[PDB]
PDB file of C-alpha atoms and ligand atoms in Angstrom:
ATOM      1  CA  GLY A   1      54.712 -29.417  11.534  1.00 39.41           C
ATOM      2  CA  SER A   2      52.685 -28.188  14.510  1.00 37.38           C
ATOM      3  CA  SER A   3      51.658 -30.794  17.048  1.00 36.40           C
ATOM      4  CA  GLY A   4      48.466 -31.234  19.130  1.00 38.28           C
ATOM      5  CA  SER A   5      48.247 -31.342  22.849  1.00 34.37           C
ATOM      6  CA  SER A   6      45.890 -31.146  25.743  1.00 33.39           C
ATOM      7  CA  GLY A   7      45.537 -28.686  28.701  1.00 32.59           C
ATOM      8  CA  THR A   8      46.512 -25.236  27.408  1.00 32.10           C
ATOM      9  CA  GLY A   9      45.165 -23.004  30.217  1.00 34.31           C
ATOM     10  CA  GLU A  10      42.000 -21.576  31.796  1.00 34.73           C
ATOM     11  CA  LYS A  11      41.121 -17.908  31.029  1.00 34.75           C
ATOM     12  CA  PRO A  12      38.225 -15.704  31.652  1.00 31.39           C
ATOM     13  CA  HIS A  13      37.917 -15.382  27.768  1.00 26.76           C
ATOM     14  CA  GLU A  14      37.674 -18.614  25.691  1.00 27.23           C
ATOM     15  CA  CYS A  15      37.479 -18.730  21.629  1.00 28.10           C
ATOM     16  CA  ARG A  16      34.245 -20.914  21.046  1.00 25.93           C
ATOM     17  CA  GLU A  17      35.515 -20.720  17.537  1.00 30.03           C
ATOM     18  CA  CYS A  18      38.632 -22.854  17.876  1.00 29.12           C
ATOM     19  CA  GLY A  19      38.984 -23.247  21.666  1.00 33.16           C
ATOM     20  CA  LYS A  20      41.630 -20.691  22.451  1.00 32.47           C
ATOM     21  CA  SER A  21      41.914 -18.746  25.793  1.00 28.42           C
ATOM     22  CA  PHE A  22      42.857 -15.084  26.475  1.00 28.62           C
ATOM     23  CA  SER A  23      43.372 -13.708  30.046  1.00 32.22           C
ATOM     24  CA  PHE A  24      42.015 -10.453  28.490  1.00 35.47           C
ATOM     25  CA  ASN A  25      39.039  -9.986  26.346  1.00 33.94           C
ATOM     26  CA  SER A  26      40.412  -7.342  24.133  1.00 32.34           C
ATOM     27  CA  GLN A  27      42.805 -10.120  23.056  1.00 29.56           C
ATOM     28  CA  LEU A  28      40.153 -12.785  22.282  1.00 28.90           C
ATOM     29  CA  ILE A  29      38.524 -10.131  20.165  1.00 30.64           C
ATOM     30  CA  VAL A  30      41.792  -9.527  18.099  1.00 28.54           C
ATOM     31  CA  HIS A  31      42.003 -13.282  17.646  1.00 27.79           C
ATOM     32  CA  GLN A  32      38.439 -14.025  16.676  1.00 27.79           C
ATOM     33  CA  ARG A  33      39.081 -11.714  13.721  1.00 29.22           C
ATOM     34  CA  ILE A  34      40.800 -14.707  12.197  1.00 28.75           C
ATOM     35  CA  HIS A  35      37.719 -16.858  12.042  1.00 28.16           C
ATOM     36  CA  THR A  36      35.154 -14.208  10.618  1.00 25.59           C
ATOM     37  CA  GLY A  37      37.913 -12.078   9.066  1.00 28.05           C
ATOM     38  CA  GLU A  38      38.714 -14.809   6.471  1.00 25.63           C
ATOM     39  CA  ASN A  39      36.936 -17.835   4.958  1.00 24.22           C
ATOM     40  CA  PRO A  40      38.833 -20.866   6.572  1.00 25.20           C
ATOM     41  CA  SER A  41      38.034 -24.572   6.424  1.00 25.15           C
ATOM     42  CA  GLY A  42      34.312 -24.539   7.786  1.00 26.75           C
ATOM     43  CA  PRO A  43      34.644 -22.010  10.545  1.00 23.19           C
ATOM     44  CA  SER A  44      31.077 -22.433  12.006  1.00 22.97           C
ATOM     45  CA  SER A  45      27.646 -24.006  11.081  1.00 23.48           C
ATOM     46  CA  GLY A  46      25.322 -21.169  12.488  1.00 24.30           C
TER      47      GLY A  46
HETATM   48 ZN1   ZN B 101      39.700 -18.951  17.634  1.00 24.28          ZN
END
């Protein structure tokens, strides 16, 4: 089972959804499609 750790890396594009980081925008965009794309466990409030 996956684990949890701190300090992943600083990138010019962070995912306010989960907290991920992508050196490039195009990337963060393809990832965010996972939050709005489906209906996970409470993605966001507003
Ligand atoms: Zn995310």
